[PDB]
Design an enzyme around this catalytic site. Structure first.
Site, mmCIF file in Angstrom:
data_model
loop_
_atom_site.group_PDB
_atom_site.id
_atom_site.type_symbol
_atom_site.label_atom_id
_atom_site.label_comp_id
_atom_site.label_asym_id
_atom_site.label_seq_id
_atom_site.Cartn_x
_atom_site.Cartn_y
_atom_site.Cartn_z
ATOM 1 N N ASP A 77 0.797 -1.245 0.000
ATOM 2 C CA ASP A 77 0.000 0.000 0.000
ATOM 3 C C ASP A 77 0.847 1.323 0.000
ATOM 4 O O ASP A 77 1.859 1.414 0.710
ATOM 5 C CB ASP A 77 -0.900 -0.006 1.222
ATOM 6 C CG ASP A 77 -1.783 -1.210 1.304
ATOM 7 O OD1 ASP A 77 -1.654 -2.147 0.509
ATOM 8 O OD2 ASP A 77 -2.655 -1.211 2.178
ATOM 9 N N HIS A 79 -0.955 4.696 -0.528
ATOM 10 C CA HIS A 79 -1.887 5.598 0.108
ATOM 11 C C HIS A 79 -1.491 7.050 0.044
ATOM 12 O O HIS A 79 -1.430 7.735 1.060
ATOM 13 C CB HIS A 79 -2.176 5.140 1.559
ATOM 14 C CG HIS A 79 -3.192 4.042 1.624
ATOM 15 N ND1 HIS A 79 -4.369 4.043 0.906
ATOM 16 C CD2 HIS A 79 -3.152 2.844 2.253
ATOM 17 C CE1 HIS A 79 -4.971 2.883 1.107
ATOM 18 N NE2 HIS A 79 -4.264 2.131 1.923
ATOM 19 N N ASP A 105 -3.668 0.215 -3.975
ATOM 20 C CA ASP A 105 -3.866 1.241 -2.951
ATOM 21 C C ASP A 105 -2.858 2.375 -3.038
ATOM 22 O O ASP A 105 -2.005 2.563 -2.146
ATOM 23 C CB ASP A 105 -3.816 0.607 -1.582
ATOM 24 C CG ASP A 105 -5.189 0.060 -1.132
ATOM 25 O OD1 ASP A 105 -6.142 0.026 -1.930
ATOM 26 O OD2 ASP A 105 -5.330 -0.237 0.065
ATOM 27 N N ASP A 108 -5.985 7.704 -1.552
ATOM 28 C CA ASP A 108 -6.711 7.932 -0.302
ATOM 29 C C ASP A 108 -5.793 7.920 0.893
ATOM 30 O O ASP A 108 -4.743 7.289 0.892
ATOM 31 C CB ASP A 108 -7.811 6.861 -0.050
ATOM 32 C CG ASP A 108 -8.979 7.001 -0.943
ATOM 33 O OD1 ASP A 108 -9.221 8.121 -1.397
ATOM 34 O OD2 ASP A 108 -9.658 5.977 -1.178
ATOM 35 N N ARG A 109 -6.289 8.485 1.984
ATOM 36 C CA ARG A 109 -5.579 8.530 3.264
ATOM 37 C C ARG A 109 -4.488 9.546 3.226
ATOM 38 O O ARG A 109 -4.483 10.430 4.048
ATOM 39 C CB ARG A 109 -5.046 7.157 3.698
ATOM 40 C CG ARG A 109 -6.028 6.024 3.481
ATOM 41 C CD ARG A 109 -7.415 6.321 4.074
ATOM 42 N NE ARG A 109 -7.555 5.709 5.393
ATOM 43 C CZ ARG A 109 -7.901 6.373 6.489
ATOM 44 N NH1 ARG A 109 -8.156 7.674 6.432
ATOM 45 N NH2 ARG A 109 -7.984 5.743 7.647
ATOM 46 N N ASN A 137 -8.135 -2.211 -3.154
ATOM 47 C CA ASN A 137 -9.537 -1.902 -2.871
ATOM 48 C C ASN A 137 -9.865 -0.391 -2.936
ATOM 49 O O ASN A 137 -11.017 0.010 -3.205
ATOM 50 C CB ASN A 137 -10.012 -2.561 -1.558
ATOM 51 C CG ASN A 137 -9.315 -2.013 -0.332
ATOM 52 O OD1 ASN A 137 -8.108 -1.904 -0.304
ATOM 53 N ND2 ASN A 137 -10.073 -1.667 0.683
ATOM 54 N N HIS A 138 -8.859 0.467 -2.806
ATOM 55 C CA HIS A 138 -9.160 1.882 -2.900
ATOM 56 C C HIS A 138 -9.269 2.434 -4.302
ATOM 57 O O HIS A 138 -9.780 3.527 -4.491
ATOM 58 C CB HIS A 138 -8.209 2.693 -2.068
ATOM 59 C CG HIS A 138 -8.459 2.575 -0.595
ATOM 60 N ND1 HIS A 138 -8.969 3.614 0.157
ATOM 61 C CD2 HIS A 138 -8.192 1.575 0.283
ATOM 62 C CE1 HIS A 138 -8.990 3.261 1.436
ATOM 63 N NE2 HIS A 138 -8.528 2.027 1.539
ATOM 64 N N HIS A 186 -3.929 -7.926 -4.174
ATOM 65 C CA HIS A 186 -4.014 -6.951 -3.103
ATOM 66 C C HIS A 186 -4.523 -7.529 -1.761
ATOM 67 O O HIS A 186 -3.851 -7.399 -0.743
ATOM 68 C CB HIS A 186 -4.916 -5.815 -3.494
ATOM 69 C CG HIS A 186 -4.902 -4.738 -2.486
ATOM 70 N ND1 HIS A 186 -3.783 -4.002 -2.187
ATOM 71 C CD2 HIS A 186 -5.847 -4.364 -1.600
ATOM 72 C CE1 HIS A 186 -4.063 -3.242 -1.151
ATOM 73 N NE2 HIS A 186 -5.303 -3.429 -0.766
ATOM 74 N N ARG A 241 -13.757 -6.132 7.564
ATOM 75 C CA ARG A 241 -13.959 -5.334 6.345
ATOM 76 C C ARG A 241 -15.414 -5.100 6.163
ATOM 77 O O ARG A 241 -15.824 -4.238 5.358
ATOM 78 C CB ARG A 241 -13.446 -6.052 5.068
ATOM 79 C CG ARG A 241 -11.979 -6.354 5.113
ATOM 80 C CD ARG A 241 -11.180 -5.094 5.444
ATOM 81 N NE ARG A 241 -9.748 -5.372 5.582
ATOM 82 C CZ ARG A 241 -8.746 -4.520 5.338
ATOM 83 N NH1 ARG A 241 -8.960 -3.237 5.018
ATOM 84 N NH2 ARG A 241 -7.495 -4.957 5.481
ATOM 85 N N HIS A 268 -2.680 -4.623 1.731
ATOM 86 C CA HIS A 268 -3.983 -4.443 2.388
ATOM 87 C C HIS A 268 -4.070 -4.199 3.906
ATOM 88 O O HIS A 268 -4.935 -3.474 4.356
ATOM 89 C CB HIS A 268 -4.835 -5.687 1.958
ATOM 90 C CG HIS A 268 -6.318 -5.573 2.155
ATOM 91 N ND1 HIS A 268 -7.004 -4.437 1.864
ATOM 92 C CD2 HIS A 268 -7.191 -6.532 2.564
ATOM 93 C CE1 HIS A 268 -8.276 -4.713 2.093
ATOM 94 N NE2 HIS A 268 -8.430 -5.975 2.519
HETATM 95 FE FE FE Z 1 -4.712 -0.171 2.241
HETATM 96 ZN ZN ZN Z 2 -6.474 -2.410 0.931
#
Ligand code: FE
Ligand code: ZN
Ligand code: CA
Ligand code: CA
Ligand code: CA
Ligand code: CA
Lengths: 378, 165
Positions: A77, A79, A105, A108-109, A137-138, A186, A241, A268
């Protein structure tokens, strides 16, 4: 100038043109790109979009399940921690001479998500056959509309760029078979994915569905007690999740043997050490699962190390790295006017009302971060 | 002797009331309120923007607020006031040198008066740079009242800049 903290670098007003970004042969000029982004400069929108669309065209032609040879550097990740990404390439090696695989990923964040994408997509255009990118997933409309990536694009660029990114994100492969030994995804496994060919049959070009093999690859996690489970049960719904499943050491061992594979490499879940080697396959003596997390001091509060995986000469070496400094931003990219105006209106009114009445830890960050790790509503 | 001229939303009665408060605040009965006369109220000693308000009120820049100035400053908060007037007053809280433009340094300092040490200066400097960058639609590197308004008008903070006299 009026500038109080003169020593602080100020973001360039110049927006890079197409000529400054793509050479005469159409090759991205990455050094010029990297430097401008590190100073927080931006590109002309059209140039940004060209990077996105050109990147997407290459991804679009790739397979659901990529085949990647070693040596390779596998990353978890990001991010939007653009400044840690610059460090990551330093530790991992130049993509000019290095094969790379990112597990997803990118966004985001972190507040430098569009820089991560513009930069990574520029690298894919330049090294289409040596740098590889998977879907996390993002990388979808649902999580980016819920978290800050959509807003970030709106602030720094436009919704048009956001949209171009959504289309590009639908093109990202879902897995990779590395050195014919490792399945790299992922999130992980699916009750509905039994062989490598099953990943090949999915239609990935879409927003991830709410249920299914595609949702699962992106979201699944190993049981919390993976490797020491009290049952030889395989999948149990992912209450962490709020979607997909938790898979067990027995589910993985089965998938591995059935597909003649050695280990599942995934990302993840944030790791204090930047990685996690799970229980060794009874058959090989090599971890059956390995988590790779490449975002140090995740969220500026986890205080975790990050890591990349460098497979070469039959040695799977984990290279850990610490965080790097990055510029500051207010939550949700709030400008200082909007930020402070409320306090002003409140405090000056209060002043005058008064005058007139003259005559009358990693885990800590982790548990605190729980809701953010789950599938946003509907 | 000699009437006093002023511009305000107030009626005779309100002006007479405000005059009474003005008298109670005017400690040295000098006819001009001073910073120390202002700071005599304990409620104000715990408020970071008192010197900004006094300065905005002190239109002739002599350091004290005379009665004319007191009434015209309090008028910005009349319930009869328009959105623009209240935003203009908010605008002047940042516009320290009264040039009609909020500069980078002015913006850093006024915010610094409110944030204090919850932000390191580097951090505070970066968000001031980017806020101006995004709002400075003229390239002059400073924020006019128009650019300021384009950013905050929708916030309706003016609805809270209302006092009763
Ligand atoms: Fe993540
Ligand atoms: Zn993830
Ligand atoms: Ca006095
Ligand atoms: Ca005065
Ligand atoms: Ca000024
Ligand atoms: Ca301007």
């Amino acid at each position: 100038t009026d500038r109080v903290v003169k020593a602080v670098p100020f973001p360039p007003s110049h927006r890079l043109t197409a000529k400054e970004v793509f050479d005469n042969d159409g090759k991205p000029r990455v050094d010029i790109l990297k430097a401008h982004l590190m100073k927080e400069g931006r590109l002309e929108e059209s140039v940004a979009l060209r990077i996105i669309t050109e990147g997407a065209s290459i991804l679009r032609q790739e397979k659901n399940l990529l085949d990647i040879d070693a040596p390779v550097t596998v990353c978890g990740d990001i991010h939007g921690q653009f400044f840690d990404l610059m460090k990551l390439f330093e530790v991992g090696g130049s993509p000019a001479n290095t094969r790379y695989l990112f597990l997803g990923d990118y966004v985001d964040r972190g507040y430098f998500s569009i820089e991560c994408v513009l930069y990574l997509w520029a690298l894919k255009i330049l090294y289409p056959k040596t740098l590889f990118l998977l879907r996390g997933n993002h990388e979808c409309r649902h999580l980016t509309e819920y978290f800050t990536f959509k807003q970030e694009c709106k602030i720094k660029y436009s919704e048009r760029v956001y949209d171009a990114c959504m289309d590009a994100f639908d093109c990202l492969p879902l897995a990779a078979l590395m050195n014919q030994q490792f399945l790299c995804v992922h999130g992980g496994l699916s009750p509905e994915i039994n062989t490598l060919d099953d990943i090949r049959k999915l239609d990935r070009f879409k927003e991830p569905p709410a249920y299914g093999p595609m949702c699962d690859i992106l979201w699944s996690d190993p049981l919390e007690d993976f490797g020491n489970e009290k049952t030889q049960e395989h999948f149990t719904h992912n209450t962490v999740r709020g979607c997909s499943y938790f898979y067990s050491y027995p589910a993985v061992c089965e998938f591995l043997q059935h597909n003649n594979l050695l280990s599942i490499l995934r990302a993840h879940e944030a790791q204090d050490a930047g990685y996690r080697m799970y229980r060794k396959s009874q058959t090989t003596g090599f971890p059956s699962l390995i988590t790779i997390f490449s975002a140090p001091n995740y969220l500026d509060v986890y205080n975790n190390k990050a890591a990349v995986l460098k497979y070469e000469n039959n040695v799977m070496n984990i290279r850990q790295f610490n965080c790097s400094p990055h510029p500051y931003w207010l939550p949700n990219f709030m400008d200082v006017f909007t930020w402070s105006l409320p306090f002003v209106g409140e405090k000056v009114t209060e002043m005058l009302v008064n005058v007139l009445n003259i005559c009358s830890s990693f885990e800590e960050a982790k548990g605190l971060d729980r809701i953010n790790e789950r599938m946003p509503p509907r | 002797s000699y009437p006093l001229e002023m511009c305000s939303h107030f009626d005779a009665d309100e002006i007479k009331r405000l005059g009474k408060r003005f008298k109670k605040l005017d400690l040295d009965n000098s006819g001009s309120l001073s910073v120390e006369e202002f700071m005599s109220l304990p409620e104000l000693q715990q408020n970071p923007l008192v010197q900004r308000v006094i300065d905005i009120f002190d239109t002739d820049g002599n350091g004290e607020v005379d009665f004319k100035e007191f009434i015209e400053g309090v008028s910005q908060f009349s319930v009869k006031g328009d959105k623009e007037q209240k935003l203009r007053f908010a605008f002047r809280i940042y516009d320290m040198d009264k040039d009609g433009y909020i500069s980078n340094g002015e913006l850093f300092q006024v915010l610094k008066m409110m944030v204090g040490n919850n932000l390191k200066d580097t951090q505070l400097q970066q968000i001031v740079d980017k806020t101006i960058i995004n709002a400075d639609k003229d390239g002059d590197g400073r924020i006019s009242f128009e650019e300021f308004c384009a950013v905050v008008g929708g916030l309706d903070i003016h609805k809270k800049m209302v006092v009763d006299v």
